[PDB]
């Protein structure tokens, strides 16, 4: 694949992981140590490299995060490989996020829906989602680590 394996957490250190094929943020209250889902953070050639466009995938890029096609965005995991996006076999814009590095952490803004950021809620082990409401309770900064 060539993609680098990433473990990521929010700034409150809740781990991003898969449960019933959903991306949850938590895993701090288990007996089992959970390391987190392997995240693919792959740059998008099909957009301008100015605001660091990336596509986020899980399970070795066999599934990718999308913001949908609707009037408002909605975070879902799609059975679309990171390869078919990269090779141009499928439209990638709803799969694209602008990455913003802020010191130790990074934030992800939907390219299809500006102002909407990949976020987590304060409540433990709830689905990762999107928000326009920055600061406050929604966590929009993420730590990144190679596995």
Characterize the biggest β-sheet.
8 strands, antiparallel
E-strand count: 13
Output the number of helix runs: 1
Order of helices and strands: EEEEEEEHEEEEEE
Q: Characterize the overall form.
A: globular
CATH topology: Trefoil (Acidic Fibroblast Growth Factor, subunit A)
Tell me the CATH architecture. Answer: Trefoil
Distance between the termini: 15 Å
So what's the CATH class? Mainly Beta
Fraction in beta strands: 35-45%
Helix content: under 10%
- Provide the domain count: 1
Structural class: mainly beta
Radius of gyration: 14 Å
GO molecular function, one term: cytokine activity
GO cellular component, one term: extracellular region
Main location: cytoplasm
Keywords: Cytokine, Cytoplasm, Disease variant, Disulfide bond, Immunity, Innate immunity, Secreted
Task: Supply database-style keywords.
147 residues, mainly beta, Trefoil (Acidic Fibroblast Growth Factor, subunit A), 8-stranded antiparallel sheet, 3-stranded antiparallel sheet, 1 helix, 39% strand, cytoplasm
Write up this protein.
With 147 residues, the protein is mainly beta. It has a single domain, classed as Trefoil (Acidic Fibroblast Growth Factor, subunit A) (Trefoil). 3% of the residues lie in helices and 39% in strands. It is built from one helix and 13 strands. The strands form three sheets. Strands 1, 4, 5, 6, 7, 8, 9 and 13 form an eight-stranded antiparallel sheet that branches. A three-stranded antiparallel sheet has the order 2-3-11, with no helix packed on it. It is globular and about 40 Å long. The two termini are 15 Å apart. The PDB classes it as cytokine. Keywords: chimeric protein, cytokine. The assembly is monomeric. The entry is titled "Crystal Structure of Loop-Swapped Interleukin-36Ra".
